[PDB]
Amino acid sequence: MTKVDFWPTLKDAYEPLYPQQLEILRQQVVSEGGPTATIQSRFNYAWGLIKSTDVNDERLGVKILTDIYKEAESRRRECLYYLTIGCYKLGEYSMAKRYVDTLFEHERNNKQVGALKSMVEDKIQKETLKGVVVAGGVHHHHHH
């Protein structure tokens, strides 16, 4: 009910949508003509595709958020933030890191950015280096 946060949390992503909620956004997008729909109409269409559990909808929303970014303007902050979240689900942390990096530079408070960037930065750092497949076994040799 707090309609004041201009940027939800990353947990909101773990909140799936019903077939009606997703079809409703399509009525507003298609009713306007579909692609010729306003940007705010397509922007939300990519938001629901990211809350989906399948990766097919996440790769589709990312492409939209990048089209609205190259064609729109001002909506860069919302895109850089949404791209970091939509990208985090595709572990493309290289793209998420570069976009969130530019946003965090803005020097804006909102500890949600410092924390979101922490999932991207902690994952590019904690992944190690050559990426270890986690040693799954037990110490065999033993005598000391």
Swiss-Prot record:
Task: Fill in the subunit field for this protein.
Answer: Interacts with DNM1 and MDV1.
Q: Could you list which ranges are Cytoplasmic topological domains?
A: 1-131
Q: Which InterPro entries match?
A: Fis1 (IPR016543), Fis1_cytosol (IPR033745), Fis1_TPR_C (IPR028061), Fis1_TPR_N (IPR028058), TPR-like_helical_dom_sf (IPR011990)
**Origin superkingdom:** Eukaryota
What does the record give as the function of this protein? Answer: Has a role in mitochondrial fission. Has a role in outer membrane fission but not matrix separation. Required for targeting MDV1 to the mitochondria. Regulates the assembly of DNM1 into punctate structures, in the mitochondrial tubules, promoting mitochondrial membrane constriction and/or division.
Biological source species: Saccharomyces cerevisiae (strain ATCC 204508 / S288c)
Gene Ontology BP term (one): apoptotic process
Q: Where in the cell is it found?
A: Mitochondrion outer membrane
A GO term, aspect molecular function: lipid binding
By what name is this protein known? Mitochondrial fission 1 protein
Keyword terms, alphabetized: Apoptosis, Membrane, Mitochondrion, Mitochondrion outer membrane, Transmembrane, Transmembrane helix
Q: Which topology term describes how it sits in the membrane?
A: Single-pass membrane protein
Q: Which gene is transcribed and translated to give this protein?
A: FIS1
Which region is the signal sequence?
Answer: none
Further details from the record: Present with 2410 molecules/cell in log phase SD medium.
Domain commentary = The C-terminus is required for mitochondrial localization, while the N-terminus is necessary for mitochondrial fission.
List, alphabetically, the Pfam families matched: Fis1_TPR_C, Fis1_TPR_N
